[PDB]
């Protein structure tokens, strides 16, 4: 059965906070289709030729 | 759960009941009839 990710229960209370020290440049990818191929089918040759 | 006085009770989840749901997705899956 599937898991949906690890356990992280985080330590809130009410008056700690925290904050980032360093950080990290990430450079993720993301792929978006933009357009088919331009097909064309005649009727008469297809259906008769 | 000490938020300061928001009282999240209605949407987190119910551990008193079966299948571990809030109040309010008890409520929206008891008014949608398959």
């Known amino acids: 059965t599937m898991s949906l990710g690890a356990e992280n229960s985080v330590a809130y209370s009410n008056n700690s906070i925290a904050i980032p020290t360093n950080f990290t440049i990430s450079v993720t990818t ?15 040759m297809y259906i008769c030729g | 759960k000490d938020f300061g006085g928001f009282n999240f009770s ?11 749901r809030s ?8 008014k949608v009839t398959l």
């Open chain 2, 10 to 20: 209605q949407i987190l989840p119910d551990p008193s009941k079966p299948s571990k």
């Open chain 1, 30 to 44: 993301e792929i978006l289709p933009v357009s088919m191929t331009k097909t064309s089918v005649d009727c008469t």
């Open chain 2, 23 to 30: 109040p309010i997705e008890d409520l929206l899956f008891n």
